[PDB]
């Protein structure tokens, strides 16, 4: 029953974005079957089916626009017809919750530990900045959680709609730029240690972090500007989302650039970096910090991959296609999986610490060692 109801709405969207009568008719045929497949409830479905036949008659005559109008009136009838969340949305909620609790407490503890050594050790500066980016990202989670609980209703305003869903993308660019800087530092410690003795100081590390943060912000603005709220009417609510309407080329362009700058180019460059570093290390007779950073780097690509795959696929698909509709329903889940980046670092630090007393003292040993 609940599955047939989604069949109706899915084909309803198909009609809304239909190019000809053939697609309208095909969609309407599937709606009829789904409606009949699904005494007071019988009447409602009966009114629905008749309206489908009305629209179906118009589409059979070849009148596409008139048939689509009759299909829009079908939505008015739907309101007269068990508001449970989709499976992917529910999993997103579970993940969101865990990431929030672990990420807020975990990264707050990291910031605490590394703040003290931040002017004494370069590594503390690196790990501090990664934690701050992860903590800040987690702050959006309660509001994202709430909106999904309220079936995507967004009562927080336009400003929050632009900012809060953007913090995960900010986290993407900030994390990977910081990791790029950390990786450059690791590379130089191993292959150009004379550079490190002449240059490497807390001052340069803080400047590199400033630039990394700044660049991340600039990379986030374009998508930030394309977020809008949208008011719905059946059932009435307010949605928060992205708007590349009448600009399918830009949607595709954004998706591709995000794939390259946010995933592919870092994957290439950091894998080269650590191939150099690991083969050097393994051919000779500091691994603690190195092992931690590799883990954090690895976890970045593991948890962003589904986001990136679904993102690219949707951009190359028509919005009326079954595969697009399926991927759309998975969007929140994919972002929730990406959000695991914002709680995974403290988990990594504690596990790496286990292989070495209290929790803050354990983080100190792992995160504030000097080279």
């Amino acid at each position: 029953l609940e599955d047939n109801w989604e069949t109706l709405n899915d084909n309803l969207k198909v009609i809304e974005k239909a190019d000809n009568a053939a697609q309208v008719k095909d969609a309407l045929t599937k709606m009829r079957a789904a409606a009949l497949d699904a005494k007071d409830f019988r009447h409602g479905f009966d009114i629905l089916v008749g309206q489908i036949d009305d629209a179906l008659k118009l589409a059979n005559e070849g009148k596409v626009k008139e048939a689509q109008a009759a299909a829009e009136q079908l939505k008015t009838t739907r309101n007269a017809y068990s508001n449970t969340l989709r499976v992917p949305d529910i999993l997103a909620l579970v993940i969101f919750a865990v990431v929030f609790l672990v990420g807020v407490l975990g990264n707050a503890l990291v910031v605490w530990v590394t703040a003290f050594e931040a002017k004494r050790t370069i590594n503390a500066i690196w790990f501090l900045n990664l934690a701050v980016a992860d903590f800040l990202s987690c702050l959006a989670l309660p509001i994202l959680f709430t909106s999904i609980v309220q079936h995507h209703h967004w009562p927080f305003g336009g400003a929050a709609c632009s900012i809060l869903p953007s913090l995960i993308l900010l986290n993407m660019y900030a994390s990977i730029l910081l990791l790029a800087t950390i990786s450059a530092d690791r590379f130089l410690l191993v292959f150009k240690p004379i550079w490190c003795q002449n240059f490497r100081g807390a001052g340069l590390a803080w400047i590199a972090c400033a630039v990394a943060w700044g660049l991340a912000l600039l990379l986030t603005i374009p998508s930030f500007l394309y977020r809008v709220v949208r008011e719905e009417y059946f059932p009435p609510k307010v949605l928060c989302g992205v708007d590349y309407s009448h600009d399918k080329r830009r949607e595709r362009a954004v998706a591709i650039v995000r794939l390259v700058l946010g995933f592919l180019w870092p994957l290439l460059t950091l894998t080269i970096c650590y191939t150099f570093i690991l083969l050097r290390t393994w051919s000779r007779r500091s691994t603690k910090t190195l092992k931690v950073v590799v883990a954090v780097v690895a976890s970045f690509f593991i948890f962003w991959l589904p986001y990136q795959v679904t993102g690219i696929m949707m951009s190359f698909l028509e919005p009326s296609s079954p595969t697009f509709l399926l991927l759309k329903k998975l969007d929140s889940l994919c972002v929730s999986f990406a959000y695991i980046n914002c709680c995974i670092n403290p988990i990594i630090y504690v596990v790496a610490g286990q292989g070495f007393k209290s929790l803050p003292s354990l983080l100190r040993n792992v995160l504030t060692e000097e080279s």
């Binding site: 869903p165 949208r230 949605l239 989302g241 992205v242 993102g311 759309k328 969007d331």
Partner: peptide, 6 residues
């Protein structure tokens, strides 16, 4: 238009 992220 598309709610959420994509």
């Amino acid at each position: 238009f598309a709610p959420x992220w994509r």
